[PDB]
Symmetry: C2
Subunit: 330 residues, 2 copies
């Protein structure tokens, strides 16, 4: 049985991370978080809740094999490095880092230690419809992937956000931050591991008070054989039943797959829906009850020293992609 | 009552344009086409129609006010130029032309003569959902437009395809050809008139026996306040209830509209469905009984020398955009 700790609860995504692991058999050994209110929430949800006063104490603890984090994004890199160097593998929230320098330092450390550095790209790994779409595609369901389209919109909730959410140095830029999901997904569907940014754009359009916050971004991508677009926003309308109408279109030679990640507008109840357009016709599949293999696959990698869950090269390359795009966007 | 003539009916959209003007109350005076099998068909559908054995006779006739065409695409330019010098207005299938050179000429002559060069961008003007979108967007239903995603797959069919369809010099490239629709839509919704092609890609990932044909395309577009992405196909899978699942998404500061033009997969009957996400909620709207005002608005332009149907500037700007995209894809 693997024991793990949560260090840095600065983002909401930590709950999904921690449940993901718990769901898979691992045991929560405690957590560190300077902020009182952030810690109060956490103890509430995880009953055992041992709250440790010092990060170093969790780090130097021989019985803990894994550190899960969602610290302030710019701070994740150095946390993950301290973790790896103390002999721990690490699962961090996206983005895993916010600059090329940090990506550089993480790759060296992962080389120097063979610890796993994983990023929970939740819009892939926590979405059964896209796990599903993944399985269809590998099984020849649409032929060759010709073109991918990722569209992700998010709800701003600004009164709710922490100060570092709006600081560019801390959050990384809209593309680094929220388009990295779609970047990983682009490399997943293609099965390729390197890609090119043909162009990128970012902007602030609706929140002129918060000028360092990017509000919209988008990117054009390609691997020779496959081509891709990605648009992201902090622009989810008040009337939307969820946080975002996320979409994934996967255009193939034999067929097209659309994934509606979260809602069907004025349609079917729930998320996450898959629509296959094949040689034979049009099928709606409901994917809610497909299994999310990542927690099993990742605790396995920790055990066998392998990479069942996500090739490490690809984990890093999704960030590199998103950083490139952020860069050329500015 | 205007009178008008069909010259070159090598592509079916002719039927659309003639029907479009007929419906508007204008009067078909005759037509010219070298090919007899096409002349036969046309004769059959319009019993009234006097076939003229020479293009020059319809050109030279001082009673016909408008020439309507859908010739082989490269040859559309030369024909359009003749019409205008010969005192006539022109309405032509998309693409208006297949090279900057043609486009350059086309602008000089139109500017010299004062005539109206108009392209029937069918996927806009002959699509009531999208016209409805426009009125919603104009009302203020979603605030400022921030991002436009046009997704345009078509069914290849050849099969039914003449020989010039697979010839680069003749059809213009996929982006010149089918991505012109989306370009004009972009300019329409953005309300602007110059935009920039940030990048663009094309390929043939499925039809190796047509080595000059373009299977797949995509272009990233912008205007300093608005961004845009476009994908087009000859890849509509064989099971699709229609020629293609075209979608248009308009992202606003306060809302989003998605138009599914042709089909709602596995949901609702017919097209063209419009979905609005709003501060207040999400509404499906039906659009099949909204009126296509292009005709009424076009003839009146001819009568008054105005540009309410579309701006002449815009008509050309779309062609320029699709051409630069086309050009910059090699």
């Amino acid at each position: 049985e693997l024991r793990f700790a949560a260090v840095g609860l600065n983002h909401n995504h930590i709950y999904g991370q921690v449940n993901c692991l718990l769901r898979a058999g691992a045991r929560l050994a405690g957590f560190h978080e300077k902020d009182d209110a952030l810690a109060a929430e956490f103890s509430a949800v995880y009953a055992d809740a041992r709250r440790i006063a010092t990060a170093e104490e969790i780090l130097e603890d021989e019985n803990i094999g894994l550190i899960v984090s969602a610290a302030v994004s710019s701070e994740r890199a150095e946390l993950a490095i301290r973790a790896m160097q103390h002999g721990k593998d690490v699962l961090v929230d996206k983005p895993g880092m916010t600059s090329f320098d940090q990506l550089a330092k993480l790759r060296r450390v992962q080389a120097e230690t063979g610890r796993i550095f994983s990023i929970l790209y939740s819009e892939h790994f926590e979405s059964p419809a896209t796990v599903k779409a993944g399985e269809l595609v590998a099984a020849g369901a649409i032929g060759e992937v010709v073109h991918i389209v990722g569209l992700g919109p998010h709800r701003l909730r600004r009164e709710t956000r922490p100060d570092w959410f709006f600081r560019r140095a801390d959050y990384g830029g809209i593309l680094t931050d929220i388009a990295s999901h779609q970047c990983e997904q682009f490399l997943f569907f293609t099965g390729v591991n390197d890609a090119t940014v043909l162009s990128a754009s970012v902007g602030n359009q609706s929140v002129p008070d918060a000028p360092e916050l990017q509000d919209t971004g988008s990117i054009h991508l390609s691997t020779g054989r496959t081509t891709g677009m990605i648009h992201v926003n902090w622009l989810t309308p008040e009337g939307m039943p969820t946080w975002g109408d996320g979409r994934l279109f996967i255009v193939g030679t034999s067929g097209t797959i659309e994934v509606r990640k979260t809602v069907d507008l004025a349609g079917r109840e729930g998320g996450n829906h898959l629509f296959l357009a094949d040689r034979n016709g049009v099928e709606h599949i409901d994917c809610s009850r497909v299994d999310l293999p990542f927690g099993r696959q990742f605790l396995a990698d920790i055990r066998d020293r392998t990479e069942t869950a996500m090739p490490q090269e690809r984990c890093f390359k999704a960030m590199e992609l998103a950083l490139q795009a952020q860069a050329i966007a500015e």
